[PDB]
Amino acid sequence: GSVEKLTADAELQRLKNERHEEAELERLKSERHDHDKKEAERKALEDKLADY
């Protein structure tokens, strides 16, 4: 396996966890979305406020 390079499994594993982080942020922006009017939870929310 020229693509394996010892472990292609390890890469698909990292990618699997990478997506976990991305799906969490998906949910985070959903929850915090109502909290932006109260506080700038995160720049992704603060930007919406920061009309530029």
Swiss-Prot record:
Residues 3-31 are annotated as: Able to bind plasminogen. Changing residue 16 to A: 50-fold decrease in plasminogen binding. It is found in: Secreted, Cell wall. A- repeats lie at residues 9-21, 22-34. Residues 13-51 have a biased composition (Basic and acidic residues). PAM has more than one binding site for plasminogen; it is thought that each of the a-repeats can bind one plasminogen molecule. Belongs to the M protein family. Binds to human plasminogen (and plasmin) via its kringle repeats. Also binds to albumin, immunoglobulin G and fibrinogen. Could provide the bacteria with a mechanism for invasion, as streptococcal-bound plasmin could permit tissue penetration. This is Plasminogen-binding group A streptococcal M-like protein PAM. It comes from Streptococcus pyogenes. The gene is pam.
